[PDB]
Design a protein around this ligand. Sequence first.
Ligand SMILES: Nc1ncnc2c1ncn2[C@@H]1O[C@H](COP(=O)(O)OP(=O)(O)O)[C@@H](O)[C@H]1O
Ligand code: BEF
Lengths: 99, 102, 452, 89, 92, 98, 93, 79, 84
Amino acid sequence: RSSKAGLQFPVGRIARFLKAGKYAERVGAGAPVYLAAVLEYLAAEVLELAGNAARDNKKTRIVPRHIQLAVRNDEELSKLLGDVTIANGGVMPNIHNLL
Amino acid sequence: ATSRSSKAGLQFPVGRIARFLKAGKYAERVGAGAPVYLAAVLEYLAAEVLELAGNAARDNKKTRIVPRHIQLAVRNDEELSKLLGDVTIANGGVMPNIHNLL
Amino acid sequence: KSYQLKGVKWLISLWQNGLNGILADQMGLGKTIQTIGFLSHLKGNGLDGPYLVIAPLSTLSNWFNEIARFTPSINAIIYHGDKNQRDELRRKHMPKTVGPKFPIVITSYEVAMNDAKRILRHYPWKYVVIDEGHRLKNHKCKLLRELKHLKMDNKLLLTGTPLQNNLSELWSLLNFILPDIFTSHDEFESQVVSKLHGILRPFILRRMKCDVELSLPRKKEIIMYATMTDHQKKFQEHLVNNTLEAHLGENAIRGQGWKGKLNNLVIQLRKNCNHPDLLQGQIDGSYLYPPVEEIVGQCGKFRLLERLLVRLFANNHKVLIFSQWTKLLDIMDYYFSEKGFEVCRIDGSVKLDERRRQIKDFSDEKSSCSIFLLSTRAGGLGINLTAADTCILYDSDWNPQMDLQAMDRCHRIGQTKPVHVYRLSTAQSIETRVLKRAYSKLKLEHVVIGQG
Amino acid sequence: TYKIYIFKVLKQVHPDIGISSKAMGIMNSFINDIFEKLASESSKLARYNKKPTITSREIQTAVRLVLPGELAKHAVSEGTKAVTKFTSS
Amino acid sequence: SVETYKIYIFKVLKQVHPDIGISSKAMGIMNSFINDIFEKLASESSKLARYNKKPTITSREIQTAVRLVLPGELAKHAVSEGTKAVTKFTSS
Amino acid sequence: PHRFRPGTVALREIRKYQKSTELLIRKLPFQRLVREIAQDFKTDLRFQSSAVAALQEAAEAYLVGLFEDTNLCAIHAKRVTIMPKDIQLARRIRGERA
Amino acid sequence: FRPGTVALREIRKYQKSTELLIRKLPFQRLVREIAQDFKTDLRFQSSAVAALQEAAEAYLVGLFEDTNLCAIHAKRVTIMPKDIQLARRIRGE
Amino acid sequence: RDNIQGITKPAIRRLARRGGVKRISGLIYEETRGVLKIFLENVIRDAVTYTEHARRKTVTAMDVVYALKRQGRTLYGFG
Amino acid sequence: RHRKVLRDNIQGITKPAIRRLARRGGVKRISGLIYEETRGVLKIFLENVIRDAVTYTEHARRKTVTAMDVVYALKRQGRTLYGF
DNA sequence: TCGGATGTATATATCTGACACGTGCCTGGAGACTAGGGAGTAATCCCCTTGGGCGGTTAAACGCGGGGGACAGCGCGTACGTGCGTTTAAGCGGTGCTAGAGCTGTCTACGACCAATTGAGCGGCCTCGGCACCGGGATTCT
DNA sequence: AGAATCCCGGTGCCGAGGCCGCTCAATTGGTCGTAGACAGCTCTAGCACCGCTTAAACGCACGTACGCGCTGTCCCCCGCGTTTAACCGCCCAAGGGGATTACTCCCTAGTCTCCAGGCACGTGTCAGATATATACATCCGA
Ligand SMILES: Nc1ncnc2c1ncn2[C@@H]1O[C@H](COP(=O)(O)OP(=O)(O)O)[C@@H](O)[C@H]1O
Ligand code: BEF
């Protein structure tokens, strides 16, 4: 189905998940489409930043450290993932008022 | 036609609680002991807060509970201050607290 | 030594057909006084090439000693320890150039396993010889994985109990000693008994204690039960039911609300049947070891040991004591040391060179340290105690072949005095359950012996 | 609203104390807030186990998770006493 | 037996960075992130439909769930893209 | 002339304002403020008169809570005066914007 | 070296790594003793104890780095137990 | 419109007094005026979203209470 | 009299570990009274989480604390854990 | 250490406007049957948490200079508190008056339910190179 | 000047990527019944203009006491080196535990029928507010 929409995520599986969790009694037709588009958008914006952080370290495969750095640089994602701890991602390097 | 509350020995409305549990569809089915248990818990918490508030009102030599007394009772006790940790009772006020010269 | 001459006739043969073998010679004879014989047979003319020997820590010492006493001059060297092993590596001899000075490489299972890299570089080893085959009875053991990295053009396995648990240990060994026996399909043995004897006649070579020479007078393994005393019964019920951690917690000097050790009742009931102090010492800190020093008599099995020992001092022939844990041997030592007896002890906690000299002293006949504490896996394998004459197994289980290897420690070529064995136990108790399990395991063992 | 029932409970603990019009609003809000916390915790408890029924075990676990220690310890006993009287009597 | 978002995240990654790959730990991190966001948006939509008296979850309250759950400049793009898909879904 | 020493009329104010429950900002400027703020998200809006009350009473309970812990930062630093440093410390180890 | 120079070596070394800073076996023993007072005769999955350590270490690292803002606010470089209490007082714990 | 200046210095001092403060620096007022605006912007942006979902043109009193409960700030006394 | 070889498990968190955690926090000098304060706040945090993770396990009739109970217990306290 | 300026703390009143009962329908209770299945309580195979060991070897514990950071004290001066005399503007009340929020009535479209397909995905086969991973030397350093 | 460090050649090996046989999920088609949207009306709900009063904000002057900087002392924390003992460990063993599937029952969801509650509106009865009065208590300066 979800080729008529230009998405890469499964609209059918999203609808199965929405109707399984019993969030409501009836689920419209545009709801899985909308929810599947706004998930691939967020995946695409995290992955681009992670790949950019991979490129600086002269690496060709992303690792958890790269997701950590990409999330902690950008303001919007750090505001959204403000209480998450990326299993083994280290910390953002920082020094204060001293040599 | 004895009500459910009298059978359970409570003062809260077991039947109205059961309707409130159904409506909103928290799930599909609801057992027969769930509303009795929930009503008993709600009555317990109510009596706890009301007793502390009545004591606070007597302490201020009054005979009518107002929001100030609820504020005093809640924020003096330990478990209640943990539970109602981030709630704002309106038309109440903070308790006296002066620290140091300040 | 005739048998040992048939022992060198069969490993010169193995060398010929290009085969690999499991020297399952009876434990308590030959083996090493037969390994170094084959090793001189080839060190003569055939040289040593890359020659590597791996063995348990305790034996490495005995082996060096034996070399120093049987063979006139075999360039040899004990590669024990770490960092200090780096210097002797080169003050050994040229790197790969093998000359008449290239010294025999003797290592341990840890060293071999931890730094195979160093020895990986060496040439196809003429003969790798593994003293205790039982170490490799698991086919997923990390030693086996690291032992394949070595480029070995010949293999050899020394043992006295080839199979102990089941047939799969026979399966894992075969694949190793002889990968021509891959047979990684559960094996086809499973009438068939004869069919198995066709595959195994070619390599396995076993002897027997009776052999021909009288030498060691027949031994006697006898089970002398004891009656569980009242206090132990009280402890046992408070566990069969519960609230033991609390009834005993009535005291609980330390670790208040001590964790309910209600795991594997069998174990927390075996510890009782060994000595109740083990439980009491933990629930209540009791920094002080039983101060009455007669509360040790509350243990029935302890009291049967004491009387046995008083009757065996009536003659003074030296005894041997074995145990499963080390807390219990410790209690024993405490008890006897209070009376004043001089004791020697080698468990796994004690160091290697330290335990080697203790034996060299225990072996001193003039010295009157008759008692000798010794934990099973601790030092129940590779130690000669011809000085002692009697073995007492306080407790042993889960694998009967574990015990046998100990009994022989005392009973081995050179033991003139006839040997007894006193497997103590408690009647109508968890101990009998284990005893029966062991009998079951032996039952399997005797079906294996009929096979032989 | 729960006002009727709230008033009843008051006349059990302080037979001579009354309540202001605004204090009863506070009490109503408090009851409505607690009920919804407990009913949502029970919903999650049932969904994590794939059960379609909210029995009186989901309510007990929701109380243990939501109310603070000494408060939850007494709420549980009250509720189990009520259910025992309901079924037995 | 166990269903996840591995295929779709991998395809999106190949669409963004044609040559970068991804390990397994990062793949699990990304799967968890998508599950978290889905749960957040869905629960807010359900509760927000419950505030009004409607038994139906349409698309226009996936709008406002997004506008409540996502911050600032992140939502203004996401919302836009959502509308895009729905149009291309129906006038197809 | 009869003057009070500095900081004695301030302590009777603390006692005065910690017994009352009244609403301490002027009502009209607050409404003009909230209407000016809301004038961005949607234009030509109407405010139910009980909503501005809820906003005012939600906003003062926030400032009173922030002041009583920018005053823990000042006493930690050996002072009795509050500067903006204390507000920024308090807001940064609360995460209010970090 | 002079007092204070190999410390900054440690701030730089440990903020690059990702590995665990508490030894595994004592931490496991601790989490087992502080659950004996909720439920006797309890067992843990091996991944349940790795998840507790990841959260605890993250918590302590996050608390140490605003305990350090309080010490600097008071014009010091040494963290004292008074700073931890100020940091936890405002976060709400 | 300079409606943020309508939060006068005496009112800020009153709020600080209820907070327990004894002395105020002279730069506190422009800091408080700025940290109030952020709080109001967040709450009002959520309230207006709730309003526009209902197709109403009047911010009501639950829109505010819902916006507040969503950001950790539960308020009793308004429904 | 010998035998007793026990210590409060609380100590297994050693001074070097606490210094490593502080160094990753950015701290340069550490007083000698920090260690017993950290060692006490850690226990409070940890026994708040284990108490809920064991309650989540008692409900399911299990006897094993799984890695998912711990994640739910952490999410109940405002902190989310990605990657398990 | 007294004597004085006020400040709160007790006691007289009135005066609301509220908090309290008593009505009225009208919607939600409870009661009785019937249906389906959702738990409940079994029986079995296993992957899996739970003791000993046992080495061993990093990491932890102990001790010893010695400096550099915390803390106390002292001086200066600047910014904030107290009180007084103007100046705004919030907050009482009166007029209206539109712009909504709420309810009801009506039809067309839209989503749940159900049968029959079939191609998506998941668990399990292999295979190779991008992670690491080791020495070994030029460069900074305080 | 003895100490600190990156880059560049040398190292394996096991986890990421491909293939796969498949089977159960998601697609197409067809019905039905009831949620939508919508149009019409009514009555609240909100906003805005005006005049008056008075309480609060605002400006100002003094003065002082609190913030901030400088200096000295001493103590405790850091860096380094040796020795002990512990975590990451190889092995051992039984086990209990944990997600599997089983007829069986009884326990909730329905469709309904009426007695019962409750909520809204219409009235009084205050009691805690507030203002005037009166002591009884406290900062303050000398
Ligand atoms: N051929 C022999 N010549 C001399 N002494 C021997 C011979 N065989 C055995 N012994 C003596 O008997 C002891 C036991 O034999 P040993 O080789 O140690 O047995 P195991 O096979 O258990 O290693 C030897 O240490 C030695 O004292
Ligand atoms: F070397 Be023997 F087996 F004691």
